[PDB]
Amino acid sequence: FRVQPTESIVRFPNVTNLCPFHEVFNATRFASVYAWNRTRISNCVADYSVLYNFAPFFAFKCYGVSPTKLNDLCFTNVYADSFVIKGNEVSQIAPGQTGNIADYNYKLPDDFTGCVIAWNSNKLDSKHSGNYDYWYRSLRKSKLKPFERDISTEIYQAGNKPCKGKGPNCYFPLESYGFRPTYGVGHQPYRVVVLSFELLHAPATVCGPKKSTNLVKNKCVNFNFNGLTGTGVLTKSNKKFLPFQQFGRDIVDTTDAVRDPQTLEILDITPC
Amino acid sequence: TTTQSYTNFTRGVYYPDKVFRSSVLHLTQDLFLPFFSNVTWFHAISGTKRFDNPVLPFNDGVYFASTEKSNIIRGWIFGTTLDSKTQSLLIVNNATNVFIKVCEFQFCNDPFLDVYMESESGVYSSANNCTFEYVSQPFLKNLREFVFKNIDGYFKIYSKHTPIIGRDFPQGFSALEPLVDLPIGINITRFQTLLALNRSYGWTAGAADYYVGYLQPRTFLLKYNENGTITDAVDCAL
Ligand SMILES: *[C@@H]1O[C@H](CO)[C@@H](O[C@@H]2O[C@H](CO)[C@@H](O)[C@H](O)[C@H]2NC(C)=O)[C@H](O)[C@H]1NC(C)=O
Ligand SMILES: *[C@@H]1O[C@H](CO)[C@@H](O)[C@H](O)[C@H]1NC(C)=O
Ligand SMILES: *[C@@H]1O[C@H](CO)[C@@H](O)[C@H](O)[C@H]1NC(C)=O
Ligand SMILES: *[C@@H]1O[C@H](CO)[C@@H](O)[C@H](O)[C@H]1NC(C)=O
Ligand SMILES: *[C@@H]1O[C@H](CO)[C@@H](O)[C@H](O)[C@H]1NC(C)=O
Ligand SMILES: *[C@@H]1O[C@H](CO)[C@@H](O)[C@H](O)[C@H]1NC(C)=O
Ligand SMILES: *[C@@H]1O[C@H](CO)[C@@H](O)[C@H](O)[C@H]1NC(C)=O
Ligand SMILES: *[C@@H]1O[C@H](CO)[C@@H](O)[C@H](O)[C@H]1NC(C)=O
Ligand SMILES: *[C@@H]1O[C@H](CO)[C@@H](O)[C@H](O)[C@H]1NC(C)=O
Ligand SMILES: *[C@@H]1O[C@H](CO)[C@@H](O)[C@H](O)[C@H]1NC(C)=O
């Protein structure tokens, strides 16, 4: 009785370049939420335990991929959107919420699958005389769409005037967050980083810290190739994949072949 | 330049996904050039050039093709205003590489490159606030076909190089392959074809032709053969 898997084989890319999460999280200064700093994490190993080493967090709230055990996944691309907002607005970063930040500074997609990490920074981002470096937008003519950065500071139209000059009825579009060390937690600054995850099987990968093992063929094997897992028998394939293809499908649109992350050999998968 | 229209191009099919299939009739809904679509033919002879380069709309996506023997077309400019006020994408080809740069450019009134070496200053006076650079191999008698799609922040370039021994487009099917996926997040509404027209060191210079079509959401059947090469397709909206 060997119809059940008799081996467990993990195959991941041989990448020793750690993802620069420390540098984005430990940046000396963060961008204003109205003009958040959007960076990209790729071609690296996605070890997420460093986040707990970085700081205690106010909220972690992964959406879509709700488990926080992210060390077993490979993403095609990872983006990191960093900004500083006040504590009372942290809840507005969830995909389905509204308010000054969700609507005018950082709208997140409704089907967002990533993680929203919040860190209390009251001792770093609050100056004795007041920290006036950070700005947020409060006035727009329409709601902000997901992941767009509205940078312009052009004075916001008011009443029925051409609106030239400020004061009588026109407003500067940004208000600023005058942070004080003596404010309560609701008004303290928080550094928020949104990690946007693209889970699209694995045409490209940013894999967590998994240790690859040797391939086993002609046996019933529990396999994990990049972000794709399953049970089956691996055999040498005679299929001609194009240089850009990583997988294959049967006539019923289920996986029947993979490209090995280390050798690029094409293997067919037969269910046990 | 001067634009004729063409109604008979049965071209522009590309692999819609990154998954191998063979001996499969696959139904998919994606942005494709419709069959028998209205495709504009640009024909310029180079005193400097037949007429100063036009700027074309991007719409949903662009099908670009040329059968050029002089190798003058070596890049494209994509963006909104195509001036210093916004960020834009510059894709250029040269004898050794393909240079893709995303920056806030101030392209000069005359977009076309001067080839005499090559001088970057003939395309733009200056650029700043650069965020992306990438280098690929040259994209190179032969008909060169490209599809430029701007979807969910990614600028996806597909291409194929098909030999031609006659004057007319070959009557047959050839699918385009993915070339490069650029994670830019760029808003593209307008683009221009960049012509690397050299000074003949009022002067006579080589001609350049190209065809431009637009993609539309359509449902297609794609016939995948034994090798996973698409050999035929049916436009279900026709
Ligand atoms: C926005 O993120 C980018 C990362 O893509 C930051 O650029 C890095 O800044 C650090 C600062 O110490 C440098 O050491 C890195 O070499 C930079 N890398 C790149 C690719 O630029 C940028 O500084 C961030 N900006 C803000 C305002 O936080
Ligand atoms: C961040 O950088 C500073 C620079 O001196 C370093 O001391 C600190 O340990 C780093 N990590 C954290 C979590 O602050
Ligand atoms: C590392 O991965 C590359 C991917 O193509 C592979 O060619 C190379 O052989 C791997 N390294 C070793 C030591 O096998
Ligand atoms: C139709 O296609 C042929 C090539 O098969 C081409 O020569 C001809 O010019 C096309 N029709 C028009 C409207 O020019
Ligand atoms: C195609 O579109 C152009 C304008 O872009 C127009 O001049 C031309 O007549 C159109 N051709 C047909 C057949 O509709
Ligand atoms: C092509 O462009 C790249 C981009 O920097 C450059 O490094 C290379 O030298 C260029 N080649 C020629 C022949 O101009
Ligand atoms: C670059 O962007 C910053 C954003 O504040 C702007 O102030 C600066 O003038 C820009 N520089 C350019 C486009 O050269
Ligand atoms: C892209 O540009 C068009 C034309 O200027 C504009 O209508 C649209 O809102 C822009 N979108 C973004 C996300 O910048
Ligand atoms: C300029 O290009 C023409 C063809 O377009 C060619 O015949 C001529 O020799 C070229 N001159 C130089 C100096 O490259
Ligand atoms: C696909 O299989 C062979 C393998 O190289 C290829 O040359 C030919 O074009 C195709 N053959 C058949 C029978 O489809």
Numbering used by the authors:
A (entry chain C): 318 to 482, 484 to 590
B (entry chain A): 23 to 30, 32 to 69, 73 to 142, 150 to 173, 184 to 244, 253 to 289
Paper text:
The S31Δ changes the NTD sequence from 30NSFT33 to NFT and introduces a potential N-glycosylation site at N30, which has been previously observed by cryo-EM in certain bat and pangolin sarbecovirus strains. To observe a clearer structure of the KP.3.1.1 NTD, we performed local refinement of the NTD and its adjacent RBD. The map was of good quality and resolved at 3.7 Å resolution. Local refinement of KP.3.1.1 NTD showed that S31Δ results in a 180° flip of the F32 side-chain rotamer into a hydrophobic pocket formed by L56, V62, Y91, F216, and Y266.
The JN.1-sublineage KP.3.1.1 recently emerged as the globally prevalent SARS-CoV-2 variant, demonstrating increased infectivity and antibody escape. We investigate how mutations and a deletion in the KP.3.1.1 spike protein (S) affect hACE2 binding and antibody escape. To investigate the effects of N30 glycosylation introduced by S31Δ and two RBD mutations (F456L and Q493E) on the structure and function of the spike protein, we determined the cryo-EM structures of the recent SARS-CoV-2 variants KP.3.1.1 and JN.1.11 along with engineered variants JN.1.11 + S31Δ+Q493E, JN.1.11.1 + S31Δ, and JN.1.11 + S31Δ. The spike proteins exhibited three conformational states: “one RBD up,” “all RBD down,” and “flexible” (i.e., one or two RBDs disordered in the density maps due to flexibility).
